[PDB]
Amino acid sequence: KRGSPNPTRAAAVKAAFQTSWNAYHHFAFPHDDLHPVSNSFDDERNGWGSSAIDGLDTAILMGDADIVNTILQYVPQINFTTTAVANQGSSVFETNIRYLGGLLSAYDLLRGPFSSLATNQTLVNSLLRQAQTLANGLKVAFTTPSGVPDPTVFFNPTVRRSGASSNNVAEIGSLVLEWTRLSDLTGNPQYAQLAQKGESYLLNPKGSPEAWPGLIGTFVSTSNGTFQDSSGSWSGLMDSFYEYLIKMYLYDPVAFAHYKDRWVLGADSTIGHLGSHPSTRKDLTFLSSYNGQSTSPNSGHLASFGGGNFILGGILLNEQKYIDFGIKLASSYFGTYTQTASGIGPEGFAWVDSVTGAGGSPPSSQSGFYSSAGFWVTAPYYILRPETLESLYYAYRVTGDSKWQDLAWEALSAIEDACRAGSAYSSINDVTQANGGGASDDMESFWFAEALKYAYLIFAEESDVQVQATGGNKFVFNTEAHPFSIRS
């Protein structure tokens, strides 16, 4: 059953985005996030207008001229040289992937194959200008003795480092894509130099021994860039590091060929050592976490992005093995969606390793559920994450099998039927509950940038943004689903 764009399906996703935007624009804008039930807002993203920037490119790919214009008019107004709140900490990582990524992807799209969605060239130019302004403040993060970025900085009263003594590999290794992109766009090499230097310490790990070739530790010293542990996983604190390794290779196969080699070691090592099968459902394959040569039968929604990453690597390297493994991953993680009462996957889940017998024991209430489902829930909530829709999307782009679109559709449908709340959509309390267990009154910006973006693209018409299975990709998605043009 060969696939093809599904207008009806794509329209539904576009409609969910429209609703979410209207509500956000009316009750929260220009604040960072909307609380759909109370109709209030928050500024978790330092009050720069997180949801507006994060959703900008999604609005461009959907052909939402009006929404695009609204945001473009706002960009020049943002003040990326300070924070409304004095002495307020700023996450180098979160700020980078959302703001810098969002501004750069919008810039690349509005100057590339989507330039029609914008007429005012001065507004388009603001995106890049504002990105450089932001980066000029964020760069203080690299003023550590080793060059390894400090995870937190401050802009108000002045630009300063938090002074942390260590950081995690995910936050250190998820800056290279957008900072290198910025240098290429501005002509100022400093940005790339800074990010790449901090990254260098992660490519030739010194200190704690690698659990396995390519599988590095989680925390790195800011004073000397050495590792102090041998633990890690494909989820929180490490996930996006492995992701950007292969993505940099897409951005420029020559300059970052070494990044590609570090990915292959990681990939091969997680396949031979992290792949785990639930004792009650051997046909399923999940990724365990690790510490030394020991692995733990636990995972969650964050690690579900893995499927798409292995697939991406298989495309860029013409290696079926990575594609097959990625397909299995996408499928297995979707099983945590399709088997709950709401049809939505849990935040955290666990199982019993079928080989080492490791892992706990299903809590009494989930005893029967584990027997047939192959996992039990440890963290029931869902906050509109996109990792699974992301992996399903890659699975479809590489196979062309409409079956994947059906799974994604089942995923989007389950999500809106339970997350539909107040003026738009919201995080839910209990996924193992048919109705979702009640909304927690929150609509994260990545709902706009990622979940709705991947859901739409899997049903949408062809374009340069779509990932090409037979190579020739001209774009690369950053960790927050913001596509950048490759070096060229």
Ligand X SMILES: *[C@@H]1O[C@H](CO)[C@@H](O)[C@H](O)[C@H]1NC(C)=O
- Indicate the annotated binding residues for Ca(2+): 479
Three-state secondary structure call for residue 290: strand
Indicate if 464 belongs to the active site.
no
- CB under 5 to 8 A by kind: which of ligand X, Ca ion, none does 224 bind? ligand X
CB of 79 vs ligand X, minimal distance in Å: 4
Mapping DSSP to helix (H, G, I), strand (E, B) and coil, where does residue 142 land? helix
**Nearer of residues 224 and 365 to ligand X, judged by Cβ:** 224
Please, which residue, 340 or 479, has the CB nearer to Ca ion? 479
What does the CA dihedral 146, 162, 183, 318 come to, rounded to 10 degrees?
70
Residue nearest to Ca ion (CB): 479
Which residues 6+ apart lie within 8 Å of 91 measured at CB?
A: 151, 152, 171
Residue 226 contact among Ca ion, ligand X, none, beta carbon within 5 to 8 Å by kind = ligand X
Q: Which of 266, 271, 263, 274 is nearest to 213 (CA)?
A: 266
- Residue ranges in 184-203 that form contacts with Ca ion under rule CB under 5 A: none
Q: Which entry of ligand X, Ca ion, none binds 221, CB below 5 to 8 A by partner kind?
A: ligand X
Give residue for tokens 């709950």. 340
Among 4, 38, 87, 224, binds ligand X (CB under 6 A): 224
Both structure tokens of 95: 């700020």
- Say which amino acid occupies 173: G
Q: How far is CA 131 from CA 67, 183, 185, 379, in A?
A: 20, 11, 10, 36
Would you call 210 a catalytic residue per the annotation?
Answer: no
Three-state DSSP class for 6?
coil
Catalytic residue among 33, 108, 387, 430: 387
Q: Which is nearer to Ca ion, 432 or 479 (CB)?
A: 479
Residue for token digits 């080989």? 355
461-464 contacts, C-beta under 8 A, 24 or more apart: 461/5, 461/10, 462/5, 463/61, 463/113, 464/112, 464/113
Q: How far apart are the first and last CA of the chain?
A: 35
Reduced to 3 states (helix: H, G, I; strand: E, B; else coil), residue 448 is helix
Asked if 235 is part of the footprint of Ca ion (rule: CB under 5 A), the reply reads no
Which residues ranging from 166 to 185 are in contact with Ca ion (CB under 5 A)?
A: none
| Single residue of 285, 445, 479, 485 touching Ca ion by CB under 5 A | 479
Q: Is 94 an active-site residue?
A: yes
Compute the distance between CA of residue 122 and CA of residue 79 in angstroms, rounded to an integer.
17
**Binding region for ligand X (CB under 6 A) out of 75-83, 86-94, 387-395, 454-462:** 75-83
Residue span binding Ca ion (CB under 5 A) among the ranges 176-184, 312-320, 339-347, 475-483: 475-483
Least Cα distance to 234 among 285, 175, 197, 192 occurs for: 285
The mark string for 82-111 relative to ligand X (x by CB under 6 A, - otherwise) is x-----------------------------
Least distance from Ca ion to the Cβ atom of residue 479, Å: 4
Burial class from Cβ neighbours inside 10 Å (0-12, 13-18, 19+) for residue 164 reads middle
Tokens representing 262 are 């570090």
Pairing mode, strands 152-154 and 286-287: unpaired
What, of Ca ion, ligand X, none, does residue 400 touch, CB below 5 to 8 Å by kind? none
The nearest distance, CB 240 to Ca ion, in angstroms, is 6
The distance of closest approach from Cβ of residue 45 to ligand X in the complex, given in angstroms and rounded to an integer, is: 17
Q: Which of residues 120-179 bind ligand X (CB under 6 A)?
A: 120, 122-123, 165-166
Output 242 or 351, the one with its CB closest to Ca ion: 242
Set 54, 94, 178, 416: catalytic member: 94
Residues 379-398 that bind ligand X (CB under 6 A): none
390 catalytic residue (yes or no): no
Residue 393 host element (H or E): helix 387-399
Contact residues: Ca ion, CB under 5 A: 479
Contact residues: ligand X, CB under 6 A: 76, 79, 81-82, 120, 122-123, 165-166, 221, 223-224, 226
**Active-site residue list:** 94, 239, 347, 387
